[PDB]
């Protein structure tokens, strides 16, 4: 996020951080419930990566975060690698997230749901803050 | 990357005014937002684009792509959860 501000700790309980055996954060994900995360297709998540929730400060050891394993990667089949059209991957967790004051589900909309232009939204993550 | 989680508010746009920018790259299952002075960026992907709808944050989009440079002028481009919730609804029934 270039030009964003630090969040309030645990105020976005659905945010996951996907990290490789290395501990490297490379993509964000979202909790739709306690057995399944949603991130992007391009991310390219494998079952050797770990889903991390409850995190706030990637660099803190004293933070009671949850490191979740991936059972199955479910890439949409309408996913268009050359286009980046339909860039949704589901992740099925081998071990259930424990819901708490800092781990919760986001709401999914209706196919029907309308979300109109000039509407003020909010995006989060642990992305380059500078280019 | 930053160590601790960041957040930015940004206005969603129509795809049309977005085409003004991204052209025929903008597809129907894709939804633009920003060009507000904030920019999603490397490492942001997979992540949440939420909106407030009748008390709750709803998953409205998924950071997917945009500027090579993360320009606060170019709108970012996210997944359009509305065009895909049908499939999500469905993987879960199944597994």
């Amino acid at each position: 996020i270039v030009n964003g501000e630090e969040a309030v700790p645990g105020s976005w309980p659905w945010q996951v951080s996907l990290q490789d055996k290395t501990g490297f954060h490379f993509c964000g994900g979202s909790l739709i419930n306690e057995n399944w995360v949603v991130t992007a297709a391009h991310c390219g998540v494998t079952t050797s990566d770990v889903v991390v929730a409850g995190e706030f400060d990637q660099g803190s050891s004293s933070e009671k975060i949850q490191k979740l394993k991936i059972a199955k990667v479910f890439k949409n089949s309408k996913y268009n690698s050359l286009t980046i059209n339909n860039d949704i991957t589901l992740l099925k967790l081998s071990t259930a997230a424990s819901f708490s004051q800092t781990v919760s589900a986001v709401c999914l909309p209706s196919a029907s749901d309308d979300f109109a232009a000039g509407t003020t939204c909010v995006t989060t993550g642990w992305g380059l803050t500078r280019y | 990357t930053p160590d601790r989680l960041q957040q930015a508010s940004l206005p969603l746009l129509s795809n049309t005014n977005c085409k003004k920018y991204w052209g025929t790259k903008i597809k129907d299952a894709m939804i633009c937002a920003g060009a507000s002075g904030v920019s999603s960026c490397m490492g942001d992907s997979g992540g949440p684009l939420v909106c407030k709808k009748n008390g709750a944050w709803t998953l409205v989009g998924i950071v997917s792509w945009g500027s090579s440079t993360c320009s606060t002028s170019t709108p970012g481009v996210y997944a359009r959860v509305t065009a895909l919730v049908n499939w999500v609804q469905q993987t879960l029934a199944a597994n």
Partner: peptide, 10 residues
């Protein structure tokens, strides 16, 4: 869903 325990601040 979508209603956190810790309310986000902007």
């Amino acid at each position: 869903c979508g209603v956190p325990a810790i309310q986000p601040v902007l």
